[PDB]
Point group: C3
Chain length 67, copies 3
Amino acid sequence: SGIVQQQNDLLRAIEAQQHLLQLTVWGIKQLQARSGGRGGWMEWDREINNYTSLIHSLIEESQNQQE
Amino acid sequence: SGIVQQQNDLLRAIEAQQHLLQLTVWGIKQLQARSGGRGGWMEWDREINNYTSLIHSLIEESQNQQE
Amino acid sequence: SGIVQQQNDLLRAIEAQQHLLQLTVWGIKQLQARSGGRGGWMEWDREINNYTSLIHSLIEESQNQQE
């Protein structure tokens, strides 16, 4: 229906924003590397990795809702 | 319904992305502090704070839609 | 309906998050400029620009769904 096409658009927006989010993460990592090893960012990295996995699962779930 | 479970998933995706967004903000702030006081970022901080409040209200509203 | 007000809230959340995303991009760019010309970020910039256009179109589409 129309509420379905709408939900699909919202999902696509979220997917595109995730790409943008990953780009900003990458940008930040390159800036951090400029001062040396990123050892102090191990936890920050882990959190980013975890929330990214969470988002990926939600995106997967949203798409394979019905089929 | 199914369109409800779908909307819930989308909301969860948005909530997870907000966590990721806050992590990138924190990362940027630490990098800014590396060169000294963050006085020049007072306005940037304010804007970030305002949009974060806006998002928090929308997330709250979305969840307490019906009840 | 209620599922419509809900979808509108989700869209507003996405729009607010896009503003936050642009703020983090701007923050990163200023940090990159601190070390000199941003020539090495031409591709990163292009990607960011492209995903931003993609998101803008999705937001436009979502809003002008029915009318």
